[PDB]
Design a protein around this ligand. Structure first.
Ligand SMILES: O=P(O)(O)O[C@H]1[C@H](OP(=O)(O)O)[C@@H](OP(=O)(O)O)[C@H](OP(=O)(O)OP(=O)(O)O)[C@H](OP(=O)(O)OP(=O)(O)O)[C@@H]1OP(=O)(O)O
Ligand SMILES: O=P(O)(O)O[C@H]1[C@H](OP(=O)(O)O)[C@@H](OP(=O)(O)O)[C@H](OP(=O)(O)O)[C@@H](OP(=O)(O)O)[C@H]1OP(=O)(O)O
Length: 1773
């Protein structure tokens, strides 16, 4: 038996008694056939048909199986995605299911399930880091990167406990921080490392790697691509292991980089902008990482949040918007969203095997109060931003779940002045948006904020002018405002409870007296909405046309008034209803509205009046409307007409859109509705019958659908028990899911026999007229058929719940299967006895005769053909609900649910009006979940009749028919195999008469033009072997008008959809022997498994035999697809545009598991010399992949690195010396040298198996001829030996594809890499002239051509014998010396990526000929100076790519440059500075490292100071190389400030100018923006005594330029390091000394920057405004002036003014005092007089935003001082 693990919302559903017998029968059919599909070696029909059906079963019944059945499903799905080398598209199909079984962690414990991880790594590395799939060998899906990560994430908490040191042993040797192989490891660490381990396993957890990898993270100070992965790792480590990390030693380093990742402009020049900060921290991962730190006993992370926001409050102000605001609004959206989820995780979540937080690490009531109080001031400034109020109201909702008494009064103090202002209208858009998130916490008066619903009704009454027909932004947010209040509070009078009753409290009796205005709200809501309608009627201005479409902005106001009025009028007492029903009736019947805009809009407002009480409302509408239709239609002969009377034509829509109340209470009016349908449905006016068809439609909709009738917040309703319960208690009703009290409308036999009586009196008389017209015996008009089809369409679409689909079962051509392919059946509650009529089959036979008559006898009747598409679109796939209306109510539910949800305590607070709709969304999901559908013989005919309409004469008819055609291809099982042979019949050359509409209509059938089914690019060989040749066979002969421009865009879209969507198809579906799990799932499940067969004696041999036949035909159809394309591209009289598609389909077939067939190897090699540049650009990309296929598999062996190097920790070990190329380079005995090819090996640690290549000649033989050769696949040898082929190949490659966009092609490189690797310079004597001719040419086309061949020689010379290596460089070392001599402007990026490419993954031993040539003379300039710079830039990329493997050549190049760097030019200085950052990149100071052999920054900079000692003319020449180096080592080094470089700062301050203008020298201009890059760089917290010693020394007394720039250094250096300094509390006393002691400067320009610095430090709360600060200024202002004393008195006026400018948007308690005595220095002398005039005029500028709130902090005696005061500039005097 099954104890269900987790189910759904189906208990409530009305047919809940039948959801156990139907669910368990499908689950038993899952266990049978999914086990039998795997065990009978079948994945093409059957492995996917029951993976989809379990994917359907999870999305329909929750889990609803047992724990033993849940580990059978996981361990079957896991072993299928971990098959070695599957088909990768079906690997995702098993993947998304296997994510769904595992994403709910609480369902399966750790002791109940375990999964290995190395099957995931071979799965990931083949799909994510494939060594193919850039040469054209594999073709992956587009979604493969994120599905595999979210699968490992779902499999990660079930990895075994001994399998993370097993995981820290494999990629820990990849952590050399210089190669690209480190972010290989760090992305594996973020994905694979187990962090959600139980607390008895942390020693086998993060403690193996935490201090090893947080110590790496704190030591970088660049921003690599892998630093953003560790913040995604450490966040996930933090959020699971709360209370087991001590983040306190690392918390100032964490918040200083979250601040730094905001990238805030600070300093009034503020940037020599580092472009390395493109990569940064995803703050959405940082919010996860702050939130998991807060609950500690020492509240240390809390004040770093208060230090964070208070430093950035001025950026949330709505005047200060900029680039930073998108990260900064996103920070407010997520931190209250995440603190609440942590509070739900520790207060209301049920326990599971996931470890809870400890009691010591849990958020206290103080801790969440102090979180709101440090975020409330930035969220209220975000409320009024220019970018909207969406991010603030989502923040303000989640803050209101925690502390309502602290967050709701600061909002409603700004809301009441916003609803009555008539000036600053933006608040009403933004304050109302924020009360809607507040609304759940506002109407619910808790034990802290009980005054909430006192503000309910006055905000609700003052919002009534918001419904105005002038704004629509106010009107939508007003309709959203009142509907979100009038679904919380019942609108009931409370006066009979206002008598003697002791239940009312002080606040609750204040509510009941205010409920006298509930009727006055609803009636004034209507008188405001009637003017909203009657002033929005449609004006017919243009006399020719008729605007019939309600626009999108007006369709929202219909639905916005259909929502916001039906929610008032449901949440409403019956006494207030019926006095408001008459206001609707006395409006909508005394007027005559235009039926287009105001017709849909009045009748929807009446539709709301009927759906709330259908008895009392239908007593007066349908007697009124039917008595006036029969008066105004059947009196005269208005059956035949041209235009109806606008009142008759009104009262149909007033009746049609009103008769869709609950269909039980329409049986009273049977003999009135049928009477008008028998009189106005057969009219002549094209709007007259469509309003009558909408009447017939909605009557059938109301009498066969299951839907809820009421949507009230209380299940009894607000009307049926008056005064039995007190209504003002259920205002904050949480609306429980159990005992919901939902009321349904299941169709009775009275409502069903009437549903067929309308169908037996209007469908059948409209079907016999269509029958005799399609037979030739009635001959109706063109509009008479059009009128009759609407009756057939509105009876089908509208009563389709009663009509069974089809019968007939087409077989014998589809896919045969060994297992069941039965269609699923879901009882959506109705029987539909299926004995009497079956009306759906009759319509399908009338149409196939009617459509056969119309397409032959009248091909021009378009509007009849549009209806036939609408009926076949509903004869096939229409049960009771619509496939698009469900998707728009699914989105409208998540728009309403996610808006008003109590995230603090779980599912128990969703309101009843949401939950009733979601149960209806569960019924409507079951009405559309037709997963399996058997392709029957009627479905073989109805789609082929759509295929005639998809190819017909008119493009309006073809476009509508193809969309039904494509939707009908996705529904039925194996239809696409039936219809490809039928749709390609319009594309054959041999066809006699095929029109151009016939032709291109069939190519819009192939080009799917949607997201559902691409019919030319299916994922099967039996379909692709027909569609791809037929595209290339078209063209050469067809009726293919290639001169029409639309058909050329069609083939360019049909070819560009194939290359975008194609994904490589498997050839071997060999299910491995490790699927005993399938036998363990078929057998012995038995708890739901009612399937007693359990047999497979020799059917498993038949399944193996049919699989090997599938494996044979998939191999056969592949090699037939190659032959049919080559017979179509080498076809005579093709157009050119059809062979580029034909080569384009051959480039996708080049496979890795196979070798391409012989005629295609001959093809792509011979098409390397093609005249079309597009073809031979593809032949380069294909022959490079052929040479990968023909690779000859070198042998390997394993090195113990203790055996070599003589003896047995992160860099440059003692047992690592053989990897470093200095002296012992191989000259004669080249073998026995242990060449380690790739760079990163052996840096950090050594792997378990360090693997190098073999010795001499154990690799395969190199020099060979055609005798010992594969005699079928090296015809490529025959072409590169022919000198006519080579001389034409060298000639085509030296063309110019473009002059600007012409770079070193990395795909011509892989062409020549695969040549000289595979053939071992058998072609190099045939390329003797064509290498020596191209180097001696001035053209950049040939220098680029030769460079791909040069680097392809070098990286092809990996496995060459020592004879061939020396014979290579004997002609190659003079060849590069020629090329490096004649290097040009358009060539040094080619050579800069030529020999920097050739040093990629080679040992520095094996290429010393470069490193003796490239380091020979880079700056000994034989010709020019730009040549010497380009000769040095190519040296840079080669030495950087062999990063740590060489200490020696870095010294030999540093020893070369250390005399030369003084006497060079600027283009060489910009290279030497770019080279010296790679000479010193190895000096890293990483946490467990060793001082490397590679040259040191401290050993070099001490020599630089020895040469700059006369400065502290030839030293100023040396600064232009040091400054250009310190510009390059800004973010391009692993430690941005070595302490010997820090005293280069006082030499830079006296040079860097003040104004920073373009008129200064290059020494000055490069010294100013070198200080900007060092201040904006980080620093370790043991450098705060070291840099502050420098800046106190530099600003002590040197020169006023240096005192100025120390201040502008500080302001953008204690901000980007703001929490390093605030941890070292001795440093903030030294900043406060230096800034204040430099207000006393002898230079005025220094001291005003000292006050600008101090004003910002006070503003970011780096310096608290203590009392001895103000005593130091207030006892400095009162200073006598006898005539040094002037500068002494001024510095107090700077100091008072610095405090004034420090709070620009608030007036604190200290603020009015130090404005009054600040204003007393206004008649002071002139240096003081400017400053007081600058400070007060800047005060008044920033304080006119909300000065009415600022003036209350002033006395009335002090307002007369500040208002009447002169601070005006010179041009007012
Ligand atoms: O069916 P939908 O629309 O796709 O949405 C499902 C979600 O998708 P899924 O069912 O897995 O496909 C699933 O969320 P995730 O698995 O992704 O986390 C459920 O979460 P869960 O219940 O496990 O988690 P908890 O209860 O929130 O802790 C439900 O989310 P809540 O409302 O928060 O959950 P409640 O249903 O209210 O209990 C939600 O049910 P609704 O239909 O009402 O939106
Ligand atoms: O010398 P490289 O240009 O750096 O290329 C090598 C080379 O691949 P090619 O056959 O394309 O030249 C290796 O092949 P072998 O010498 O071992 O025959 C291959 O090794 P595998 O075939 O075992 O994959 C290795 O790949 P890897 O670094 O994953 O070991 C790959 O290096 P790249 O992937 O960086 O190109």
């Amino acid at each position: 038996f099954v104890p269900q693990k987790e189910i759904v919302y189906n208990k409530l559903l009305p047919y809940a008694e039948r959801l156990d017998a139907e669910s368990d029968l499908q689950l038993a059919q899952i266990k049978c056939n999914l086990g039998r599909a795997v065990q009978l070696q079948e994945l093409w029909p059957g492995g996917l048909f029951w993976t989809r059906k379990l994917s359907t079963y999870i999305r329909l019944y929750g889990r609803k199986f047992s724990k033993e059945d849940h580990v059978l499903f996981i361990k079957l799905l896991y072993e299928l995605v971990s098959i070695p080398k599957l088909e990768i598209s079906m690997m995702q199909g098993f993947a998304r299911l296997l994510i769904n079984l595992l994403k709910k962690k609480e369902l399966l414990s750790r002791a109940d399930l375990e999964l290995p991880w190395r099957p995931l790594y071979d799965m990931v590395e083949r799909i994510l880091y494939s060594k193919t799939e850039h040469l054209g060998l594999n073709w992956f899906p587009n979604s493969v990167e994120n599905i595999l990560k979210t699968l490992v994430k779902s499999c990660r908490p079930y990895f075994p406990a001994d399998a993370t040191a097993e995981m820290l042993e494999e990629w820990r040797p990849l952590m050399c921080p210089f190669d690209v192989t480190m972010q290989k490891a760090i992305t594996y660490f973020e994905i694979f490392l187990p962090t959600s381990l139980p607390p008895e396993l942390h020693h086998k957890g993060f403690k193996l790697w935490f201090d090893e990898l947080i110590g790496l993270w704190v030591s970088v100070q660049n921003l690599p691509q892998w630093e953003g992965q560790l913040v995604n790792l450490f966040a996930r480590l933090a959020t699971d292991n709360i209370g087991y990390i001590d983040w306190d030693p690392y918390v100032p380093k964490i918040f200083t980089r979250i601040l730094r990742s905001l990238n805030l402009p600070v300093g009034s020049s503020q940037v020599l902008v580092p472009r390395f900060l493109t990569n940064a921290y995803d703050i959405g991962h940082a919010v996860i990482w702050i939130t998991a730190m807060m609950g500690g006993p020492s509240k240390l992370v809390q004040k770093h949040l208060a230090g964070l926001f208070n430093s950035i409050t001025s950026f949330y102000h709505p005047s200060n918007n900029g680039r930073w605001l998108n990260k900064l609004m996103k920070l407010l959206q997520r931190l209250p969203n995440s603190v609440v989820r942590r509070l739900h995780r520790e207060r209301y979540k049920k326990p599971s095997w996931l470890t809870p937080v400890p009691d010591s690490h849990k958020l206290t009531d103080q801790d969440v109060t102090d979180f709101v109080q440090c975020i409330i001031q930035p969220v209220l400034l975000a409320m009024f931003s220019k970018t909207g109020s969406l991010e603030a109201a989502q923040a303000l909702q989640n803050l209101a779940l925690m502390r309502p008494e602290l967050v709701i009064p600061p909002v409603l103090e700004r809301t009441y002045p916003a609803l009555e202002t008539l000036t600053e209208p933006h608040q009403l858009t933004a304050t109302l948006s924020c009360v809607i998130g507040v609304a759940r916490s506002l109407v619910s008066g808790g034990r802290w904020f009980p005054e909430g619903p006192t503000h309910m009704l006055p905000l609700l009454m003052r919002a009534l002018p918001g419904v105005d027909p002038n704004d629509f932004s106010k009107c939508m947010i007003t309709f959203q405002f009142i509907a979100t209040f009038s679904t919380l509070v019942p609108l009931v009078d409370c006066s009979s409870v206002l008598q003697e009753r002791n239940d009312l409290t002080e606040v609750e009796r204040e509510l009941c007296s205010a409920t006298a205005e509930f009727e006055d709200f609803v009636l004034q809501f209507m008188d405001r909405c009637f003017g909203l309608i009657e002033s929005s009627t449609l004006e017919q201005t243009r006399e020719e046309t008729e605007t019939e479409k309600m626009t999108h902005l007006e369709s929202l106001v219909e639905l916005g008034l259909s929502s916001t009025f039906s929610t008032i009028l449901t949440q409403c007492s019956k006494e207030i209803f019926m006095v408001a029903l008459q206001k609707v009736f006395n409006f909508s019947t005394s007027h005559i509205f235009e039926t287009r805009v105001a017709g849909r809009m009045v009748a929807d407002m009446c539709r709301a009046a009927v759906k709330c009480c259908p008895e009392e409302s239908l007593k007066l509408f349908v007697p009124h409307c039917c008595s006036v239709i029969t008066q105004l239609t059947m009196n005269d002969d208005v059956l035949n007409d041209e235009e109806l009377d606008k009142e008759l034509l009104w009262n149909l829509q007033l009746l049609s859109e009103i008769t869709r109340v609950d269909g039980r209470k329409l049986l009273l009016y049977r003999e009135q509705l049928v009477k008008i349908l028998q009189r106005t449905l057969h009219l002549t006016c094209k709007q007259g019958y469509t309003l009558s068809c909408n009447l017939l439609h909605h009557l059938l909709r109301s009498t066969t659908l299951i839907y809820p009738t009421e949507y009230c917040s209380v299940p009894g309703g607000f009307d049926k028990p008056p005064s039995e319960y007190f209504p003002i208690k259920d205002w904050g009703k949480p609306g429980d899911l159990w005992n919901l009290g939902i009321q349904w409308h299941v169709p009775s036999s009275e409502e069903v026999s009437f549903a067929f009586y309308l169908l037996d009196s209007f469908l059948q008389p409209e079907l016999v007229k269509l029958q005799h017209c399609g037979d030739g015996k009635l001959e109706m008009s063109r509009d008479d058929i059009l009128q009759s089809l609407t009756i057939v369409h509105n009876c089908l679409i509208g009563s389709g719940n009663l009509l069974p689909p089809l019968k007939g079962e087409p077989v014998t051509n589809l896919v045969p299967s060994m297992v069941s392919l039965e269609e699923t059946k879901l009882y959506t509650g109705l029987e539909y006895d299926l004995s009497r009529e079956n009306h759906r089959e009759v319509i399908a036979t009338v149409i196939r005769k009617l459509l056969n008559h119309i397409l032959d006898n009248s091909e021009d009747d378009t509007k009849s053909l549009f209806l036939i598409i609408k009926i076949i679109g509903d004869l096939l796939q229409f049960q009771g609900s619509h496939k698009h209306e469900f998707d728009s109510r699914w989105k409208s539910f998540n728009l309403v649910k996610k808006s008003m949800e109590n995230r603090l305590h779980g599912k128990k607070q969703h309101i009843r009006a949401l939950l009733i709709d979601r149960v209806m969304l569960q019924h409507e999901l079951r009405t559309l979940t037709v997963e399996g559908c058997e392709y029957k013989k009627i479905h073989q005919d109805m789609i082929r009749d759509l295929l005639r309409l998809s190819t017909s004469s008119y493009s309006q008819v073809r476009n509508k028919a193809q969309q039904t055609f494509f939707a009908a291809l996705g529904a039925y099982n194996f239809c696409c195999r039936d219809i490809i042979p039928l749709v390609l019949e319009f594309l054959r050359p041999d066809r006699q008469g095929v029109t151009q509409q016939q032709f291109k209509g069939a190519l819009y059938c192939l080009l799917g033009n949607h997201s559902g089914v691409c019919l030319a690019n299916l994922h099967d060989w039996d379909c692709i072997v027909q569609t791809w040749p037929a595209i290339v066979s078209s063209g050469l002969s067809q009726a293919m008008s290639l001169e029409k421009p639309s058909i050329v865009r069609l083939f360019d879209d049909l070819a560009e959809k194939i290359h975008r969507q194609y994904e490589t198809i498997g050839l071997d579906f060999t299910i491995p022997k490790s699927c005993v799990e399938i036998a363990e799932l078929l057998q012995q499940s038995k708890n739901p498994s009612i399937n007693q067969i359990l047999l497979s004696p020799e059917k498993i041999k038949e399944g193996i035999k049919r699989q090997q036949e599938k494996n044979a035909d998939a191999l056969r159809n592949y090699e037939n697809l190659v032959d049919t394309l080559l017979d179509g591209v080498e076809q005579r009289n093709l157009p050119w545009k059809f062979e580029h598609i034909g080569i384009g389909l051959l480039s996708l077939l080049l496979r890795d598991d196979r070798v391409l067939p012989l005629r295609a190897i001959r093809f792509f090699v011979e098409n390397l010399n093609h005249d079309a540049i597009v073809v031979r650009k593809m032949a380069i990309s294909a022959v490079a992949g052929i040479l990968k296929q023909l690779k000859r598999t070198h042998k390997k062996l394993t090195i113990n690195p203790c055996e070599i190097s003589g003896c047995p920790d992160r860099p440059d070990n003692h047992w690592l010396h053989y990897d470093s190329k200095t002296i012992p380079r191989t000259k004669k005995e080249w073998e026995s040298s242990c060449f380690v090819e790739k760079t990163h090996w052996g840096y950090y640690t050594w792997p378990k198996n360090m693997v190098v290549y073999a010795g001499v000649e154990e690799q395969p033989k190199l020099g060979r001829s055609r005798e010992d050769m594969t005699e079928a696949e090296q015809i490529i040898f025959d072409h590169f030996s022919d000198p006519k082929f080579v001389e034409q190949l060298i000639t085509f490659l030296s063309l110019e594809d473009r002059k600007g966009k012409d770079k070193f092609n990395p795909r011509r490189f892989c062409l020549f890499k695969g040549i000289f690797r595979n053939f071992d310079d058998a072609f190099l004597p045939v390329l003797k002239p064509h290498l020596e001719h191209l180097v001696a040419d001035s053209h950049e086309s040939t220098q680029r051509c030769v460079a791909e061949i040069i680097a392809g020689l070098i990286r092809g010379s990996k496995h060459w014998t020592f004879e061939k290596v020396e014979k290579l460089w004997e002609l190659l070392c003079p060849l590069l010396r020629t090329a490096l001599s004649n290097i040009t402007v358009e060539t040094y990026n080619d050579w800069g990526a030529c020999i920097a490419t050739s040093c990629e993954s080679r040992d520095p031993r094996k290429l010393h000929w470069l490193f003796e040539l490239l380091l020979e003379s880079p700056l000994s300039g034989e010709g020019g100076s730009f040549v010497d710079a380009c000769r040095l830039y190519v040296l840079q990329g080669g030495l950087a790519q062999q990063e740590w493997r060489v200490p020696e050549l870095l010294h030999r190049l540093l020893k070369y440059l250390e005399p030369k760097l003084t006497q060079v030019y600027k283009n060489v200085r910009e290279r030497i500075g770019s080279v010296l950052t790679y000479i010193f990149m190895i000096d890293v100071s990483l946490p467990n490292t060793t001082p490397t052999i590679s040259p040191h920054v401290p050993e070099f900079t001490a020599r630089i100071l020895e040469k700059l000692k006369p400065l502290m003319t030839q030293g100023i020449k040396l600064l232009k190389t040091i400054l250009k180096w310190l510009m390059a080592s800004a973010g391009r080094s692993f430690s941005t400030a070595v302490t010997e470089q820090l005293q280069l700062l006082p030499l830079f301050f006296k040079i860097a100018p003040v104004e920073n203008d373009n008129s200064y020298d290059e020494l000055k201009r490069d010294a100013k923006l070198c200080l900007s890059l060092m201040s904006q760089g980080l620093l370790y917290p043991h450098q705060v005594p070291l840099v502050l010693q420098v800046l106190k020394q530099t600003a002590r007394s040197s020169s006023w330029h240096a005192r100025y720039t120390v201040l502008t250094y500080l302001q953008t250096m204690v901000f980007y390091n703001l929490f390093i300094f605030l941890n070292n509390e001795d440093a903030v006393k030294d900043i406060r000394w230096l800034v204040i002691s430099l207000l006393e400067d002898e230079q005025l320009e220094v001291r005003e920057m000292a006050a600008t610095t101090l004003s910002g430090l006070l503003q970011c709360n780096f310096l608290t405004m203590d009392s001895p600060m103000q005593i130091h200024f207030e006892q400095l202002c009162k200073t006598k002036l006898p005539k040094a004393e002037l500068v002494k008195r001024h510095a107090g006026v700077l100091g008072l003014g610095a405090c004034v400018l420090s709070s620009p948007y608030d007036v604190p308690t200290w603020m009015p005092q130090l404005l009054m005595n600040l204003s007393a220095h206004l008649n002071d002398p002139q240096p003081i007089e400017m400053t007081v005039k600058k400070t007060l005029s800047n005060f008044r500028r920033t304080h006119h935003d909300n000065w009415q709130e600022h003036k209350q902090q002033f006395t009335d005696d002090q307002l007369l001082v500040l208002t009447d005061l002169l601070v005006s500039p010179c041009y007012y005097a």
